Ligand binder design. Sequence first.
Ligand code: HEA
Ligand code: HEA
Ligand SMILES: CCCCCCCCCCCCCCCCCC(=O)OC[C@H](COP(=O)(O)OCCN)OC(=O)CCCCCCCCCCCCCCCCC
Ligand SMILES: CCCCCCCCCCCCCCCCCC(=O)OC[C@H](COP(=O)(O)OCCN)OC(=O)CCCCCCCCCCCCCCCCC
Ligand SMILES: CCCCCCCCCCCCCCCCCC(=O)OC[C@H](COP(=O)(O)OCCN)OC(=O)CCCCCCCCCCCCCCCCC
Ligand SMILES: CCCCCCCCCCCCCCCCCC(=O)OC[C@H](COP(=O)(O)OCCN)OC(=O)CCCCCCCCCCCCCCCCC
Ligand SMILES: CCCCCCCCCCCCCCCCCC(=O)OC[C@H](COP(=O)(O)OCCN)OC(=O)CCCCCCCCCCCCCCCCC
Ligand SMILES: CCCCCCCCCCCCCCCCCC(=O)OC[C@H](COP(=O)(O)OCCN)OC(=O)CCCCCCCCCCCCCCCCC
Ligand SMILES: [Ca+2]
Ligand SMILES: [Cu+2]
Ligand SMILES: [Cu+2]
Ligand SMILES: [Cu+2]
Ligand SMILES: [Mg+2]
Lengths: 42, 265, 260, 547
Amino acid sequence: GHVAGSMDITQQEKTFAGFVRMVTWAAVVIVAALIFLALANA
Amino acid sequence: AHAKNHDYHILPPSIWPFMASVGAFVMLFGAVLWMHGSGPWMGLIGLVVVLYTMFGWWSDVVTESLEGDHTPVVRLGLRWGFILFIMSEVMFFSAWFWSFFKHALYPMGPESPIIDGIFPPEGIITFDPWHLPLINTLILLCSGCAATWAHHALVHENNRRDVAWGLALAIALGALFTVFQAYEYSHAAFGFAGNIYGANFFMATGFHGFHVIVGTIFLLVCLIRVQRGHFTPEKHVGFEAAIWYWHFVDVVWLFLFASIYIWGQ
Amino acid sequence: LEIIGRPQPGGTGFQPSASPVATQIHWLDGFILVIIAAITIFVTLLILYAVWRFHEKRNKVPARFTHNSPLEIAWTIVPIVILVAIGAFSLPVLFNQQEIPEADVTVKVTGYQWYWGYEYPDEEISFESYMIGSPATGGDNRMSPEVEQQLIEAGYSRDEFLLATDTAMVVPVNKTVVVQVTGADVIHSWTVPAFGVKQDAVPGRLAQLWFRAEREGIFFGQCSELCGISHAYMPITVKVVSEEAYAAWLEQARGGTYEL
Amino acid sequence: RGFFTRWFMSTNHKDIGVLYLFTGGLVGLISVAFTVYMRMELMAPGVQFMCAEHLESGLVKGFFQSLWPSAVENCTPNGHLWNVMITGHGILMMFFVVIPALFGGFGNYFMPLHIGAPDMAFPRMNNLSYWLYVAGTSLAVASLFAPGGNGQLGSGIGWVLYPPLSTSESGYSTDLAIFAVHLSGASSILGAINMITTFLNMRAPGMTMHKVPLFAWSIFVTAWLILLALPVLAGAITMLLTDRNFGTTFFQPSGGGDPVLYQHILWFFGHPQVYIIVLPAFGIVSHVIATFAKKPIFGYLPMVYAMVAIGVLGFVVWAHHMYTAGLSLTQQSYFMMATMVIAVPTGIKIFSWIATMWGGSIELKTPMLWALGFLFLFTVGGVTGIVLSQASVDRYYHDTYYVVAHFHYVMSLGAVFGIFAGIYFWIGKMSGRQYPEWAGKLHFWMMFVGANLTFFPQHFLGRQGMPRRYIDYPEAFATWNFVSSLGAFLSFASFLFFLGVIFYTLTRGARVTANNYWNEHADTLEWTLTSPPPEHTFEQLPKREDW
Ligand code: HEA
Ligand code: HEA
Ligand SMILES: CCCCCCCCCCCCCCCCCC(=O)OC[C@H](COP(=O)(O)OCCN)OC(=O)CCCCCCCCCCCCCCCCC
Ligand SMILES: CCCCCCCCCCCCCCCCCC(=O)OC[C@H](COP(=O)(O)OCCN)OC(=O)CCCCCCCCCCCCCCCCC
Ligand SMILES: CCCCCCCCCCCCCCCCCC(=O)OC[C@H](COP(=O)(O)OCCN)OC(=O)CCCCCCCCCCCCCCCCC
Ligand SMILES: CCCCCCCCCCCCCCCCCC(=O)OC[C@H](COP(=O)(O)OCCN)OC(=O)CCCCCCCCCCCCCCCCC
Ligand SMILES: CCCCCCCCCCCCCCCCCC(=O)OC[C@H](COP(=O)(O)OCCN)OC(=O)CCCCCCCCCCCCCCCCC
Ligand SMILES: CCCCCCCCCCCCCCCCCC(=O)OC[C@H](COP(=O)(O)OCCN)OC(=O)CCCCCCCCCCCCCCCCC
Ligand SMILES: [Ca+2]
Ligand SMILES: [Cu+2]
Ligand SMILES: [Cu+2]
Ligand SMILES: [Cu+2]
Ligand SMILES: [Mg+2]
């Protein structure tokens, strides 16, 4: 019953793509914020 | 699995984990004794064991991919996990960078915190950013470019001589950074004990260097793999992590460089 | 001797209001407590109610709703309005206590492991206070005939054991006192519940805190920040006296004698 | 199946789940024990038990005498004992106990089943998780026997290790505890990674993120916090280790250091910790409310989003734990305001629960009682936190017993409830042996009774100013103490009850033969399987309709 590699991974590949995008958004949002703060109150 | 319908990897038992947890316990407890007047022997034993563990464990990692366990999803699973690892790494450095930035902005002085002191600390001699610093930054940027060039060849042209060529170049430039780094210590104008700037300056680049070494080692592994023909354009996970990781190091150094050499002078 | 600000056996409230900030602190907590008193009660009453009104034998069949928009909105605004409120009556009480006035006197309090360190920069006065049981005064931090007697002679009673100090820090009624706290060695914290004030002595740091008493007496504060073994052995005592006897205190504390 | 094969070389995520449970039980007990000791001494004024004199006697010797009163007169107040105890508790409890049952015992085992995945993404790694957790514990415990401050053994510093106290304290005791904390960090960060890959990658076809059980979302948010918060705490404590072993001066004013930054670096991770502890609890509650009120969990998206809500705010409210350690007014406001915000998200969770019960039929089974206690007490707790959130009020409250109560109400009467909630509800599924519906009730009633006694009095003490971590206190404070202490014994009783109840059940319990012993409304995939589930759950992937 071996069929290595013939499973459907459509849903995971879409997931990772989202994951990828979500983090980038996050990261950049923080740095922005950090910078803001800096500017505002450092 | 007798009759599965899924590509996920299920694993036979494995002692490695337990082994490594004893090695570390011993490692650290020996490491506590050794910073308390007593003898090294216990410490190195701990690490010796851990290092035996890790090698195995990772050897087996490869072995398991060779038995065709690394199906399409599996491959993605590892990719992902490794990425959380660099996320974590990024957080750790956020501690060290957080001290630097606070002290650099609000250094302690006799009226702190109504009033702040001065940074860099009185009688501290910050290094010259364009003399050696830039050197080490060109050295990594370059290596970066030489390690990625390996990557693309392999995946894009399937050129393997070129692939190992990029890797050696990249590996020997990583070590060079180390060598130059150490020079910097040798010629440091301030000390490590008794003065915030030394602790920050040293622990921070101290941690980064740690990683370069790790990085340069990792790569070494790939070259070896690449020499015994362990990589194809479709299957090449060690390689993917490698290049991802080397890049994170470089990023961290570049921010250091901007944060402690260039911006803190 | 008027011993006012002190714990009262079996007490479940606060300590007498010795000053404006205390005054407001009690009021703030009061007001905040009923607002959450009502929330808590409220939240149980539904729980109970529902548990019985919809216990299986009372309603054999379950319902299938999962969403009621109008109600969710209600329960997300409500709280929000609640919090704002609290805001309205909270910031102000933080600002009055963190924005420090022109002083009428000024001490400097230095947390030393296992004792405090008072200074009156204008009056060139500097002395230290220790508990009566401190090994500094023969004892090992626990009642003993000696201790009992020592305290009687102090003007205190057997029961104020762990609060009395060999050395009081005297102070003027109606006068504004600014206390600049710092630690000597590790981290301590100085504080006087009746004044409604408290703060941490920290190595390498000058922190400021202001207080005004409206009335005379002996108020008592304890070290609040794990600073080692005798962490429960560094009482704080503050005296507040008339201004005519404050001045004579000055002169009398110049001769090396540091007691009132 | 070698016994050594099975537990010592585990690759299966249901066994690792069990290992963490008992492991975490164990330590809890040990820790819990330290709790009676304290209560004992705090029952009444003066120092009757922690005398200096017992130090002359070998450890074997004085130990036993320490469980028996001495007269004030002949008792020599050894504060250091008390400090070392207090910290035995705290360190054990937030790092060895409660996060390893609730995150690595119930999560490891079940989060996977609920999504309908074969096993966790990284089995070998996971086993390594469980073992690092032991070292952690062991170093941590060993520390109570090594060269401590004041010539005694043991580090009497604080669950969090603040300096300079933590950096000046003699011996190497604290070095062990520092490294313990690291190995624990390690553990959760391996754990964390594994569940994050697992849950996004291995769910079943047709299972969308918006189609996942509460409980696994809870572990998901939990895991993210972990990932982003332990790292920062590795750093903090590295600075404490290099200051004491490499004469650095991070938080040493003589070298330009600043003890307060430490508090910033450690509470930025010391806030995320609680949201890890309760997260999972919220998860197990939903299940249990869902199943026993035989009705779908109200407002499922909002629940999920609530959870994300909290976790994110959880990184931007850490100076609430520093309201008196010397902060700008602008810093107190920002931290007071933003910390108040978390209310929104939690209430939503609290209301939804009450609204789940509303209009469903209810089954007061053991499991449910906990879940309902939890709704109550966690609210109790909660409110306090708002009172503590107001810098203003904090002055008077900070460091006093008023804050002790607020954490125990949401921890001991909160997350803890969850733990048990989880336990009763899933004991057959993972054992093939059900427990006694009487005992359970009894246990739940004792514990609620005595744990209320334990901590409710502590609110009084807090407003009557009794300071924290004192080994003795004034005459005025005897009354309540008594009560409290009494309280504690009762609860300690109970915990004993439970262990036996547990023991019995795993001995003489009702063999379980149904795949769902509860009722139709417990709908996730754990219930489709045997009772005690197969070694390889989900070789065949759970068909879409299956649930
Ligand atoms: C999991 C454990 C846990 C949880 C879940 C919480 C949750 C909260 N905690 Fe805390 N807390 C601790 C564990 C926890 N805490 C610990 C251990 C300490 C001490 C650490 C140490 O020093 O060692 C501590 C300390 C602590 C302090 C500092 C005390 C000091 O100065 O020493 C503060 C101050 O703001 C605080 C606040 C809060 C708040 C606002 C919440 C919020 O999460 C509460 C939210 C819940 C509700 C708000 C109720 C739900 C809402 C409704 C039912 C709506 C109706 C009510 C309203 C709208 C108001 N906690
Ligand atoms: C959530 C963690 C946790 C838990 C469960 C407890 C449980 C208890 N704790 Fe506490 N405690 C802390 C965390 C916890 N504690 C912390 C962090 C501090 C501050 C430390 C410091 O200053 O550094 C503290 C402090 C503290 C103090 C005062 C410290 C002082 O003077 O400054 C007291 C005082 O009486 C106390 C009492 C108790 C009691 C009676 C119990 C319980 O015995 C009461 C009821 C609970 C039970 C009877 C059992 C619960 C059992 C489990 C949850 C088992 C889990 C394993 C399995 C379920 C399989 N604790
Ligand atoms: C490739 C070459 C590389 C070159 C790159 C060049 C670009 C350089 C990039 C550098 C970025 C570093 C930024 C440094 C941050 C400085 C900002 C700061 O520290 O301000 C703190 C702010 C002010 O401090 P304060 O004490 O008020 O000072 C008052 C003086 N009058 O403090 C306050 O006002 C108190 C307010 C508290 C508010 C808390 C807000 C939270 C902060 C962000 C949330 C963190 C959550 C992150 C989550 C991580 C996980 C996702
Ligand atoms: C002075 C000299 C002294 C030197 C002492 C020597 C001791 C030796 C230590 C070296 C360790 C060896 C490292 C090699 C690890 C990589 C394993 C690997 O590449 O296989 C994993 C897999 C590859 O699969 P794939 O590439 O798809 O297969 C293609 C084949 N067709 O891809 C994967 O599964 C991904 C796995 C990623 C590896 C994780 C790395 C992250 C951990 C970093 C922690 C740092 C540890 C350093 C130790 C310090 C002690 C604390
Ligand atoms: C300012 C914040 C910066 C934070 C530092 C983060 C360092 C980033 C690491 C850089 C290394 C990347 C160099 C790429 C060279 C070769 C590898 C590569 O190109 O991987 C491509 C991959 C796309 O993957 P994919 O096509 O989806 O795979 C099969 C899809 N089914 O694309 C990937 O998945 C790459 C994965 C590596 C991720 C490393 C860790 C990411 C962590 C979050 C950092 C995000 C940074 C934010 C940037 C701001 C941009 C505005
Ligand atoms: C590694 C390769 C690239 C680098 C990766 C890491 C990037 C890190 C960049 C920044 C990291 C955090 C830097 C924070 C700077 C804050 C400086 C500071 O300490 O502010 C002072 C304030 C307290 O000042 P105080 O002493 O109390 O008052 C005196 C005023 N007279 O202190 C405060 O109120 C706190 C200030 C805000 C605290 C911010 C902490 C958040 C840490 C998480 C950072 C998230 C990194 C995400 C990276 C994205 C990658 C994909
Ligand atoms: C609080 C912050 C403290 C910092 C410590 C952080 C972690 C320490 C642990 C070191 C080792 C973990 C390295 C993590 C890299 C993981 C990257 C990843 O996703 O690896 C995937 C691979 C999968 O594992 P597996 O279950 O075997 O799956 C087989 C599928 N073919 O996973 C692997 O290849 C696993 C390899 C593990 C290597 C063995 C070493 C164990 C080390 C424990 C010592 C911890 C002490 C940390 C000291 C740092 C102090 C700052
Ligand atoms: C401002 C200061 C802030 C302070 C820091 C705050 C961080 C708190 C961290 C909490 C982590 C919670 C993450 C939960 C995100 C969930 C969102 C989600 O699930 O959206 C649904 C979307 C829909 O996909 P759909 O197809 O409908 O269903 C799946 C079918 N395959 O699903 C997708 O597209 C996939 C979703 C994947 C989940 C992403 C998880 C990553 C989130 C963490 C951000 C990390 C920031 C890192 C910063 C440091 C980096 C070095
Ligand atoms: Ca006693
Ligand atoms: Cu003190
Ligand atoms: Cu103290
Ligand atoms: Cu908090
Ligand atoms: Mg404090």
